[PDB]
Design a protein around this ligand. Structure first.
Ligand SMILES: O=c1ccn([C@@H]2O[C@H](COP(=O)(O)O)[C@@H](O)[C@H]2O)c(=O)[nH]1
Ligand SMILES: [Mn+2]
Ligand SMILES: [Mn+2]
Ligand SMILES: [Mn+2]
Length: 168
């Protein structure tokens, strides 16, 4: 009933607007449920390779945006969606967030307080003692998704240890 998601984006059009180029979904244990490079809907004007890890070769034969979007939305349907600053991911997915139940590490005040500070890298470093997004190949949405899921588990356990009910 819980799934963590992270997407990587490239720049589209003359104004290099963020466009969905990769999406990774993992379960509560970090098992990868979905991981695909996606052809965004528009002209790629900036691969942002150093950060997105997306190269023009990755886009060759990649799943069309409209198709991947349906696959991802189907997997998120009815579940608690875990992630960091999910607002931007749903914008990339061109999907209204309203009906979704989410858990966002970027707005979890508990993690904020415990980290004594919101970037996912900082939270991961201070609370998970895990260094992420350091590869010269670019960020890994699988690693980023796992980091948010781990942060979610930590938050739930801290709440439990302090006598607080777990987040619904
Ligand atoms: O310093 C950054 C961080 C993120 N992004 C964009 O945001 C996407 C998601 O970033 P993240 O989920 O790895 O933080 C990247 O694939 C990239 O398009 C950047 O351009 N620069
Ligand atoms: Mn992200
Ligand atoms: Mn933001
Ligand atoms: Mn990422």
């Amino acid at each position: 009933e819980v799934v963590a998601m992270d997407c990587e984006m490239v720049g589209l059009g003359p104004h290099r607007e963020s466009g969905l180029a990769r999406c990774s979904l993992v379960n509560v244990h970090g098992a990868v449920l979905y991981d695909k490079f996606i052809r965004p809907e528009g002209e790629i004007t900036d691969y942002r390779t150093r950060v997105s890890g997306v190269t023009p070769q990755h886009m060759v034969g990649a799943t069309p945006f409209a198709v991947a979007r349906l696959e991802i939305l189907q997997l998120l349907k009815g579940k608690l969606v875990v992630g960091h600053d999910l607002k931007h991911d749903f914008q990339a997915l061109k999907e209204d967030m309203s009906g979704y139940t989410i858990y966002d590490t970027s707005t979890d005040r508990l993690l904020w307080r415990e980290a004594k500070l919101v970037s996912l890298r900082v939270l991961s470093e201070r609370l998970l003692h895990k260094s992420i997004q350091n590869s010269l190949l670019g960020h890994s949405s699988v690693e980023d998704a796992r980091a948010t899921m781990e942060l979610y588990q930590i938050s739930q356990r801290i709440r439990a240890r302090r006598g607080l009910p777990r987040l619904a």
